[model samples]
Target: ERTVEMYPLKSRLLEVVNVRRITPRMVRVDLGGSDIAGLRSDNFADHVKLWFPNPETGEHVLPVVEDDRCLNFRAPGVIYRDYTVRRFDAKARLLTIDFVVHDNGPGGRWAATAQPGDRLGVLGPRGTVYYPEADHYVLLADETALPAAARRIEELPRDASVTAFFEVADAAEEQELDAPEGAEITWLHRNGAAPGTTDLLLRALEQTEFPKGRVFVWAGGEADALKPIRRLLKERGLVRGRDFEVDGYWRRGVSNLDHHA
Candidate 1:
């Protein structure tokens, strides 16, 4: 076992104050404390590590601290998964994290039964990918990416035009998003089928018209589903660090592989 002090650390323990089921497959957890106030708004898309205990031993594993930020912790026989901050209510000192209950992963399991006063460890606010200067925005995502997409849309300028596409298993998986009237939101249903194989997101991209002058595109979800859309954007001259970001939140067969690219 690793010594506690030897491990890397970021923020300390904040209380798990509330848990609510926002949808059939989604749950919202609210964390509260002064420690959480240190996080910045621009980092809404960044991931945080949720620590779970070994089911049999009940021993805790902490992630290593790296360069003034704690990257990831080791949880032997424990499960760890990446999640996005849906929204942060700074005035109320509340941090909301949304989780998708697709399987029996640690994060999913925790969210399913999480209750107020439950204790858990969280690591970093890490990166912030902002789109303030773009004239028009293009957003693509599936159910896993909806929390971040919804939050991003809510934060955009009212005058900014946005073309957003969301792919989900069925129409019931689609939730109403709070977006400005100038932002056009499209919900693309996959009809309870496998993602990436259907080319729904790519088809959506092909059917739409791209706006000229500083187009910002943000996409996440199945890796295969995003490839063609990403290729089309790049082939049309929309490059990363300027007009494009493609993220594979989770892969088809690989479980718990969520990283930003």
Candidate 2:
């Protein structure tokens, strides 16, 4: 069984130390501050909420953790988005988050234009799920979930058996990742299709042969698209919370999707 650990929720305002365009379609932002001290992110797939400022006033209304330990973002005009922890350095107190720069969404816009010393509100990872002990692991993701998938592949044991399928805009969208010698990593290109408008992930999963021997699957991307993939996995006798962990990173026509909800 996978061991899941909960963490005390924290609300902190972090300063963007640097921003760089790691790829044609992705922006990497490094955030730091005393607030980052003791931040807990035990798993490769852990994520956090990044609260953006009000568009009109440019005022940041950060969440507050009250005595009841409830984190509140009750103020009007609070803009925020969920993002994966691409990398975290405890010694330097640095947290790296990679954002896909898309046409729509404030998160992308903010990341694209983010500069040094810019303040951003950050909320809890809240918990971490330790990777399952299995003979084989299957990871599926799109650009949005690539950070998590990349981290998972890089952080897994050198001898761990991993197969990762990543769908991106095109060849240029691919990032250099470090994986074990035996690990298989496949990159699927959209060519030019708009995000959330393609079934590349589903088709890839459908055409492939799932590895044998206690395989654990993890996937994330568009909500609607993931539905079919989820059904396919279940139909193949994989159990949720046991055999797989699938998430909806976003949905077409929806803003700020609460995937956990």
Candidate 3:
């Protein structure tokens, strides 16, 4: 069984304190502010909506929070994107998010030139889904899911068994993840094939032999590409939400698609 915890909806302004190109294709932004205090994120899948400055106005405005339980995201001159919480250091009051470096989106553009003084509005992890412990863990993902997958691998028990298949542009996109000593981590390079347009992860899944035990699976990637994978999991007799989770982090040819919806 799974447990879900809901958090109060809050909006706050945070300033970028550090930016680093962790990989050739990913940028890590560290944000800090008084607002970072008491921020809650206990699960790797926990995410927050990051409000970027409106392109037309060059101004950033946060959504209004009413009743401490809801947010008005229809504010004019406001655009936001969902990003997973890479890490949250409570003592240091720092929050981190990794952004894929692509010019096709606002989040990418902002992260490209993000500086120490740059500020953005952050709202709601909203809730957390506590993953149940299992004998073996299977992780399937693409660049879009790297932050969440890497964090999940790190947070799991040191002795836990994990097998991860991550599809990226190339070897250059790989980063140093703090994985368990014997964890099996596989990198599937798309090699110039555009993201969200390949079936590398699906092929990998179809061919691998899962360990024998009570296993849990987590996957996030292109919406269309994941369709077959979802069916495959179901065909394998794994029930969604209980034995596995197949999430569409994004879709091809769609802008600002809400994967959750």
Clashes of each: 3, 0, 0
Writing each residue's lDDT as its tens digit, candidate 2 over 112-166 gives: 7878988888887878987557878889999999999999888877878988889
Model 3 C-alpha lDDT per residue in residues 13-128, reported as the tens digit of each score: 99999999988889999999998777999999899989899676777777678887545566666788889999998988999999998888888887788789988889889889
Among residues 3 or more apart in sequence or in different chains, the pairs in candidate 1 whose N, CA or C atoms overlap within 3 Å are 8-64, 8-65, 63-73
TM-scores for all predictions: 0.85, 0.96, 0.97
Colliding residue pairs in candidate 2: none
Q: Which ten residues in a row have the lowest lDDT in candidate 1?
A: 1-10
Q: Which stretches of candidate 2 lie over 4 Å from their true place?
A: 68-71
